[PDB]
């Protein structure tokens, strides 16, 4: 009640390190927290659902923004079969010169990663042909997460 | 006391070892912690300067030593952080010292103020200042 | 031949300092005064923590941004001409 596991006094009384280890482990078991009722459990579940939706929308928006900013969508749409899609750029202080020269692929001017997710084809099929569309979609998804 | 979990050996109990360990800055009880921390930081930074400049990623170029020196300073900063939090979670504002009260002979002696909020704060400040000064001195001596 | 006394428990439980010393400070008074006056601003704990965090972050960011391409191979970029893919992909 006074230590880190505020939802469980029994786990907060012991002096060993397991109090930390179990504290992370039982944070989502709402039926184990002391002084619990049905109303509180249902409301916490509802709030967790909302948070999960926000996280999903933020993830999709980030993917769209990175593809727009550091990708080659406009070069890929013209020749789909002879262009390798790009996911995001690579910045690494540990890279040597051979790694920098060898990781440059596609039309990029620096090291990049090839996207095996398959979102280029999905976005091309539904009717996106420019970077502005991707930017608008990212903005809309950020608004939805908020 | 034979029933205490410790043994008496020539290494652990010798006049030379006892004198050398009691004269170290970490065991001077009477001295205020700032002057001990300054010396500790100076020695630690002066020691730490070397390996970074001798085995760094740029150790073969002309910048090498300078870069290494910078790295050493950065380490000191991190170490200082690792001290500060250790105080905050350990010593409260109004509690007294928790050091042992009586010596090995049995005489009552004043407990060390290092195990206190103000004492540990002074120790950390002195350690940071001494570490920075020692790193600067080592760099200046090595590359001037 | 006794080892348990109820009147005091420091000796019974073994509360001693093995290598503690109570001798006066050997440092010179002038050097001590100089170090005390010059190392004062770092005595506070919260101020020291905030200053350390902000200064470290700012210095690291400034050094990373201002660094040139000679030190960092990543900032130098590629030099050789590009290469083709396995199936002729660009």
């Amino acid at each position: 009640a006074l230590r880190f596991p505020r939802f469980s006094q029994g786990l907060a009384q012991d002096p060993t390190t397991r109090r930390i280890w179990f504290g992370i482990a039982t944070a989502h078991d709402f039926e184990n927290h002391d002084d619990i009722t049905e109303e509180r459990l249902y409301q916490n579940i509802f709030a967790s659902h909302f948070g999960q939706l926000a996280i999903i929308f933020l993830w999709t928006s980030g993917n769209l923004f990175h593809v727009a900013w550091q990708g080659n969508f406009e070069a890929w749409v013209q020749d789909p079969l002879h262009v390798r899609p790009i996911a995001h750029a690579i910045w690494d202080p540990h890279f040597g010169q051979p790694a920098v020269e060898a990781f440059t692929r596609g039309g990029a001017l620096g090291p990049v990663n090839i996207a095996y997710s398959g979102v280029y084809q999905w976005w091309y099929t539904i009717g996106l042909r420019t970077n502005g569309d991707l930017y608008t979609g990212a903005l809309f998804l950020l608004f939805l997460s908020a | 006391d034979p029933f205490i979990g410790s043994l008496e050996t020539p290494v652990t109990s010798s006049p030379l070892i006892a004198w050398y360990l009691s004269n170290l800055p970490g065991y001077r009880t009477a001295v205020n912690p700032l002057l001990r921390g300054v010396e500790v930081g100076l020695a630690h930074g002066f020691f730490l300067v070397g390996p970074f400049v001798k085995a760094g990623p740029l150790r073969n170029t002309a910048y090498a030593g300078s870069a290494g020196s910078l790295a050493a300073a950065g380490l000191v900063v991190i170490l200082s952080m690792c001290l500060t939090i250790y105080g905050i979670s350990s010593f409260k504002e109004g509690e007294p010292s928790i050091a042992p009260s009586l010596t090995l002979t049995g005489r009552k002696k004043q407990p060390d103020q290092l195990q206190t909020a103000d004492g540990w704060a002074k120790f950390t400040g002195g350690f940071f200042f001494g570490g920075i000064s020692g790193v600067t001195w080592a760099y200046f001596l090595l590359y001037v | 031949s006794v080892y348990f006394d109820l009147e005091d428990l420091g000796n019974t439980t073994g509360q001693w300092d093995v290598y503690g010393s109570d001798a006066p400070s050997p440092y010179n008074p002038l050097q001590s005064k100089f170090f005390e006056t010059f190392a004062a601003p770092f005595t506070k704990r919260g101020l020291l923590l905030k200053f350390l965090i902000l200064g470290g972050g700012s210095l690291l960011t400034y050094v990373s941004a201002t660094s040139t391409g000679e030190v960092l191979p990543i900032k130098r970029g590629p030099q050789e001409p590009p290469k083709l893919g396995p199936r002729g992909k660009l």
């Binding site: - | 952080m81 939090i85 | 990373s64």
Partner: peptide, 30 residues
């Protein structure tokens, strides 16, 4: 531009240190 050279060190190093310090202080607090 040069945004990655400013943002990668921030997320990689400074933020984990701040989060670790805050979490350690909150856990150790009584």
């Amino acid at each position: 531009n040069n945004l990655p050279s400013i943002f990668v060190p921030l997320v990689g190093l400074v933020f984990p240190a701040i989060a670790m310090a805050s979490l350690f202080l909150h856990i150790q607090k009584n």
